[PDB]
Write a protein that binds this ligand. Sequence first.
Ligand SMILES: [K+]
Ligand SMILES: [K+]
Ligand SMILES: [K+]
Ligand SMILES: [K+]
Ligand SMILES: [K+]
Ligand SMILES: [K+]
Ligand SMILES: [K+]
Ligand SMILES: [K+]
Ligand SMILES: [Mg+2]
Ligand SMILES: [Mg+2]
Ligand SMILES: [Mg+2]
Ligand SMILES: [Mg+2]
Ligand SMILES: [Mg+2]
Ligand SMILES: [Mg+2]
Ligand SMILES: [Mg+2]
Ligand SMILES: [Mg+2]
Ligand SMILES: [Mg+2]
Lengths: 114, 177, 82, 80
Amino acid sequence: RIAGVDIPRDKRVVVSLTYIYGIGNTTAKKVLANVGVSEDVRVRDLTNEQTDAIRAEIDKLKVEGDLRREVNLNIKRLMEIGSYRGIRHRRGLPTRGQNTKNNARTRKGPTKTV
Amino acid sequence: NRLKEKYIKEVTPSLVEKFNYSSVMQTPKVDKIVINMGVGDAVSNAKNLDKAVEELALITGQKPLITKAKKSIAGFRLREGMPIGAKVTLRGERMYEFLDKLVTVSLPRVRDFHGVSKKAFDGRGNYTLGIKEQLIFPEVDYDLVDKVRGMDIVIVTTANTDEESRELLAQLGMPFQ
Amino acid sequence: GRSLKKGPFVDDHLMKKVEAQQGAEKKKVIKTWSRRSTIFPSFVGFTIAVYDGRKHVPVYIQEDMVGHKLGEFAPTRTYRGH
Amino acid sequence: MKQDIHPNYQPVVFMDSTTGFKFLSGSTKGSSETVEWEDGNTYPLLRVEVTSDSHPFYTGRQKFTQADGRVDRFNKKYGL
RNA sequence: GCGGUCGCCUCCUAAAAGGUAACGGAGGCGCCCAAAGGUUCCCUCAGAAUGGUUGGAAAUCAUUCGAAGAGUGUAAAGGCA
RNA sequence: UGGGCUACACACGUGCUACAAUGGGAAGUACAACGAGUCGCUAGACCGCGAGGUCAUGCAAAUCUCUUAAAGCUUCUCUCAGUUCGGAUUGCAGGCUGCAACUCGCCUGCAUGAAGCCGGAAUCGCUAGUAAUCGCGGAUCAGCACGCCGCGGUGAAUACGUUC
Ligand SMILES: [K+]
Ligand SMILES: [K+]
Ligand SMILES: [K+]
Ligand SMILES: [K+]
Ligand SMILES: [K+]
Ligand SMILES: [K+]
Ligand SMILES: [K+]
Ligand SMILES: [K+]
Ligand SMILES: [Mg+2]
Ligand SMILES: [Mg+2]
Ligand SMILES: [Mg+2]
Ligand SMILES: [Mg+2]
Ligand SMILES: [Mg+2]
Ligand SMILES: [Mg+2]
Ligand SMILES: [Mg+2]
Ligand SMILES: [Mg+2]
Ligand SMILES: [Mg+2]
């Protein structure tokens, strides 16, 4: 659709935009402000011209594969230089300094009873 | 017809010059193109092969021949004659038309397309390109695909050497690395 | 993070050592207890033996490593597993 | 070619939207839009944003900036 | 006595026709096929190398090399490109 | 001086946040109490999306400030969706405090968007301004609380009865 992802049709335009990777609610508000499109109108209602203007704004923004490639390079960079954060990333542990005696399940994964 | 036109006009004299051919008959030409889609998933469900066949037919403009496993293999749960894998053969106008479409449209729509391999040659002047995913062809419609898949396109030419093959494919347009 | 106005931080003794060795054909390992000191483009290309709490571990500095504190590149505690 | 067993095939023109370069070739897909063509023949028209001419690799120039080094980033941030 | 065997097919024993014994050495049969029969037309294998998404030693595809090293429902011998 | 007490295949206790519509978001509007304050509380103004920053004012305080509290009420929006719920993890970019924030601080913006659809055996608190729920202050304290101490706002259900 807009940036290579088929955004939901019924939802309001701001929410449908958020469905794009790299775009949050604040960014959707900003791009709609630039294009002049109202936030309430649904995307299905949006005219083809409004959709084209929205495409221009998103293409100005970085999203989807471009954003994902950038972040993966950063993480790869940490791991390759062998930083403490890189080791955290490699071993799937909290990078941001949380304690790992308890919790940490998000990084660790499902519990292993052993 | 554009690609045939390009071939006969520019490519043919240019290859003649570079490779010092005594008679134009010596000019290598794309003899045929065989697009092969190996579907091992058919064993799990034949409809995967069915949909793969449909997508391939849309891509090629010809109904594919459903090749069958010549030998039963217990490793892949494969029984002899199982209809796994399809192929289509294109010659002449259809061959040139599909090749030109590949050069222009299908190739760019590949994710992070860095060009095509430059070593995938058999050593006789015949090349093969491994397309990892469909949806690059305009006829797939990016939604009809329930399970994404790939394919292998075999360009068989009259060239004796990978060098003449490489030049011909480059002249017709091939984003070699 | 560190206030932009404050600028990057580095221990003066470490900075003086790297400065003295800037005009050096072959870099010699600089031994530092200073974990806090930030890496600098000048630090690039040097081998620094950073104390980890029990010994100085050498690390080769590169433009890729710069922008980070030295101490992060020397792990403190070891965890082999269970 | 056997009859009534092959997917419908029709000649179709292609224009690169970004640059307008035109090439005529057959395809299964049909476009409601149609354009004329030398030899006085009309064909359905399929507009494509990216083609060989449009693609940077064919031209020999690349749009991408290739990102920034961390040394340069550090100098820019700290005014050094 | 115990064990084994009892009819039929193939090989070796069998001594270059045929035949030829032993509680000699090896195996098979008590069917299967509505095409796996008849005929007309058409085709040629197995493997190896190189290249190639999933795909891996090995699935399907392409070129070359390849006289049979494949196949011939079912044992072996004979035969068949 | 540096590191550790902050480790992390796992087990448990105590809490916070949720799983949504008695809700989420946006806008408007109203009502407290206990307490703290001198290099401390900081008005007002300006810049900043924000965390904050600059100038600068009053107050050793029933005088000035922290301090217009939040639930609440009124409109608009969302329409039962792992979602406009959820806010973990992660990337980048910042703000402070401090000689110094990698090990290892809190906070902000953007981006990402984890498990979670009300929870087995079992088990806990509470009889009224109580439980439930909502904020506010303070001690420690350069900085740093989902903990502790205290304050107020809204405000229920049930008690037949003593067999267990
Ligand atoms: K920790
Ligand atoms: K716990
Ligand atoms: K027959
Ligand atoms: K315990
Ligand atoms: K807690
Ligand atoms: K509401
Ligand atoms: K710290
Ligand atoms: K405090
Ligand atoms: Mg998004
Ligand atoms: Mg901590
Ligand atoms: Mg005889
Ligand atoms: Mg005889
Ligand atoms: Mg037969
Ligand atoms: Mg402790
Ligand atoms: Mg629900
Ligand atoms: Mg009581
Ligand atoms: Mg209360």
